[PDB]
Design a protein around this ligand. Structure first.
Ligand SMILES: O=C(Cc1cn2ccccc2n1)Nc1ccccc1
Length: 330
């Protein structure tokens, strides 16, 4: 089997991407944030505290003839932005782009943090990291990908995120028309539950490539590119007037600037992030100070190849017995 679904930016800055997902019978379609940095499929629901729901579409398990309460199971998760959610668990039929899994754990939110409430466009998350990170207790549950894997034509999914435009998540096949040149594959460590890999280095604009190992995670659920302070300083030094602002919480730059590109290494290959992918716009409405898309990972404890990096590539998440990651230009 295979599946293919379009993923759409939630706003004009590509802050996140939503993909429609069919849950239950008859189908209830919710727009989920596909997140390769976590492993829980959770949704706004009829059980979510009413004051914490503000425009989201909810899953109502009582209206699904295939929903079954997973007795005794609860979940609770936090993310790198300090947001969180928790609740109980159903199993139900879940389809993505024509690919169907029966008995998928659908984690129903009883509580969500303010950032989720305040974002009307995201109805929940669909985790695509390794199932070892799944938070369901006392019986850990499998991701949608993990459940589907054995049925897929090939045990892979691909992320093809757009810049200010829709893109595609495919399951079970590699669309050879969706990228240019070749896909370069690179080793993955699953030891922390993430799609963790090592970039071979970077360049800033037309500058020389610096060969240096940068361990990080391929994370579709994180907006920005978070890299070591040395790398980030080298990037922003090429932008006149850019500075790190403790009050704003990162590098900002004059909105009048033309940003240089940023290249990262994948083996001997190179992925180029155009400068305008790194512009996240005014820090507040009407400001001439703009927020940068490359930020320091110091304090996070891990480097994160988030959407800013991933949307410059066609990315293969290879879930073979020994997982690997593939990157191609597009
Ligand atoms: O937390 C994540 C993945 C992530 C962040 N998110 C924020 C909002 C919505 C979804 C979502 N997913 N990645 C991460 C961050 C820090 C350290 C390790 C992984």
């Amino acid at each position: 089997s295979t599946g293919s679904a379009t993923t759409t930016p939630i706003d004009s800055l590509d802050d996140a991407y939503i993909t429609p997902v069919q849950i239950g019978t008859p189908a209830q379609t919710l727009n989920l944030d596909f997140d390769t940095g976590s492993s829980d499929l959770w949704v706004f629901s009829s059980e979510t505290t009413a004051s914490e729901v503000d425009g989201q579409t909810i899953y109502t398990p009582s209206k699904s003839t295939t929903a079954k309460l997973l007795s005794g199971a609860t979940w609770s998760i936090s993310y790198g932005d300090g947001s969180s959610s928790s609740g109980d668990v159903y199993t139900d039929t879940v389809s993505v782009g024509g690919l169907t899994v029966t008995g998928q754990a659908v984690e129903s939110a009883k509580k969500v943090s303010s950032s989720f409430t305040e974002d009307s466009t995201i109805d929940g998350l669909l985790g695509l990291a390794f199932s070892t990170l799944n938070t369901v207790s006392p019986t850990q549950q499998k991701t949608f990908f993990d459940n589907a894997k054995a049925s897929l034509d090939s045990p892979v999914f691909t992320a093809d995120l757009g810049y200010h435009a829709p893109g595609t998540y495919n399951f079970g096949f590699i669309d050879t028309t969706a990228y240019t040149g070749s896909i370069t594959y690179t080793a993955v460590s699953t030891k922390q539950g993430f799609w963790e890999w090592t970039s071979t280095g970077y360049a800033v604009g037309s500058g020389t490539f610096k060969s240096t190992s940068i361990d990080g995670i391929a994370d579709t659920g994180t907006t920005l590119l978070y890299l070591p302070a040395t790398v980030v300083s080298a990037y922003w030094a090429q932008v006149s007037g850019a500075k790190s602002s403790s009050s704003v919480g990162g590098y900002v730059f004059p909105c009048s600037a033309t940003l240089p590109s940023f290249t990262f290494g994948v083996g001997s290959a190179r992925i180029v992030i155009p400068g305008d992918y790194i512009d996240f716009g005014p820090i507040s409405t009407g400001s001439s100070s703009c927020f940068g898309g490359i930020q320091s990972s110091a304090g996070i404890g891990i480097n994160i190849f988030g959407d800013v990096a991933l949307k410059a590539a066609f990315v293969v998440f290879n879930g073979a017995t020994t997982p690997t990651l593939g990157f191609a230009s597009k």
